C-alpha cells in the first residue's frame, strides 16, 4: 500500500456510493404493489431488480474479497424467506422466478446497505497491485480485480436504472 492509492480508493468509494443512494431513492415510499409491477408478463420487476443487484454485488465482492456473502453471514436469506434456493442470486432465474422475489422495501434497502458496508470495507484498502490481480482466468481477457469491480458497478447501475424507469410508470 501507498498514499497514491487514495485516488483509486476514492473513485471506487464514490461509484459504489451512488448505487446505495439510488437504493435509498427507489425504496422510499415503495409499496408492495409497485415493487411487484411487471410492464409485460415476462419483464423484471422493481423488487427483483433491487434484490438481484444486491445479490450480484454481494457474491461478486465477497469473491474478490475472499469473504462470506452477507446474505448468509448475517441471516438475510432467512429474514427474506423467499421460496427459492438459499444460494440463488437471480443469475439463473426464469421469467416465472421473478414473481417469487417479494420483500418489504425496508428489507431490500437493509440488505443492500449491508452489502454496501461489505463493499466499502473491501475497496477502502485497494492497492495498485490488488487492482491488477487476476480473479477469473476462464475468460479472455482474464478478469482483473479492476475490471471485475467496474463490471459490478455497471451491472448494478443498469439494474437500478431499470428499476427507476419502472418506478416512474408502475
Question: Please, which of residues 38-67 interact with its own copies by CB under 8 A?
Answer: 39-40, 43-44
Stretch that binds its own copies, among 26-34, 37-45, 68-76, 110-118 (CB under 8 A): 37-45
Each as own residue / partner, the long-range contacts of residues 145-151 (CB below 8 Å, 24 or more positions apart, any chain) are 145/64, 148/60, 148/64, 149/12, 149/64, 149/123, 151/60
State yes or no: residue 99 binds its own copies (CB under 8 A).
Answer: no
Measured between alpha carbons, how far is 119 from 112 in angstroms, rounded to an integer?
A: 10
Candidate residues 2, 91, 96, 137; the one interacting with its own copies per rule CB under 8 A:
2
State in angstroms the smallest separation of the CB of 104 from its own copies: 24
Question: Please, which of residues 66-95 interact with Cl ion by CB under 5 A?
Answer: 88-89, 91-92
| Closer residue to its own copies in complex, CB, 105/149 | 149
- Annotated ligand binding at 5? The verdict is no
Q: How many CB atoms lie within 10 A of CB 122?
A: 20
Residues in CB range of 128: below 8 A, 6 or more apart: 2, 4, 5, 8
Candidate residues 1, 11, 24, 121; the one interacting with its own copies per rule CB under 8 A:
11
Measured between alpha carbons, how far is 34 from 132 in angstroms, rounded to an integer?
A: 42
Element containing residue 143 per DSSP (H, E) = strand 143-144
Question: Please, which of residues 108-147 interact with its own copies by CB under 8 A?
Answer: 128, 131, 146-147
Burial class (CB in 10 A: 0-12, 13-18, 19+), 70: buried
- Annotated ligand binding at 93? The verdict is no
* C-alpha cell of residue 136: 477469473
State yes or no: residue 6 binds its own copies (CB under 8 A).
Answer: yes
Binding site for its own copies (CB under 8 A): 2, 4-8, 10-12, 14-15, 18, 22, 39-40, 43-44, 128, 131, 146-147, 149-151, 153-154, 157-162, 164-166, 168-169
User: Which residues contribute to the annotated binding site for Zn(2+)?
Assistant: 52, 87, 155, 159
Amino acid at each position: 500500500p501507498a498514499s497514491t492509492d487514495a485516488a483509486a480508493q476514492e473513485l471506487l468509494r464514490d461509484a459504489f456510493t451512488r448505487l446505495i443512494e439510488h437504493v435509498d431513492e427507489l425504496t422510499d415510499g415503495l409499496t408492495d404493489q409497485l415493487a411487484c409491477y411487471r410492464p409485460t408478463p415476462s419483464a423484471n420487476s422493481i423488487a427483483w431488480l433491487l434484490w438481484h443487484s444486491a445479490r450480484v454485488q454481494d457474491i461478486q465482492v465477497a469473491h474478490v474479497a475472499g469473504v462470506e456473502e452477507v446474505w448468509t453471514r448475517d441471516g438475510w436469506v432467512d429474514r427474506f424467506g423467499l421460496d427459492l434456493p438459499r444460494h440463488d442470486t437471480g443469475y439463473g432465474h426464469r421469467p416465472e422466478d421473478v414473481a417469487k422475489v417479494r420483500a418489504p422495501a425496508d428489507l431490500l434497502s437493509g440488505y443492500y446497505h449491508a452489502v454496501h458496508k461489505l463493499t466499502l470495507e473491501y475497496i477502502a484498502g485497494m492497492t495498485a497491485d490488488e487492482l491488477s490481480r487476476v480473479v477469473d482466468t476462464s475468460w479472455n481477457p482474464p478478469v482483473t480485480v479492476s475490471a471485475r469491480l467496474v463490471s459490478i458497478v455497471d451491472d448494478c447501475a443498469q439494474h437500478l436504472g431499470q428499476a427507476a424507469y419502472l418506478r416512474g410508470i408502475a
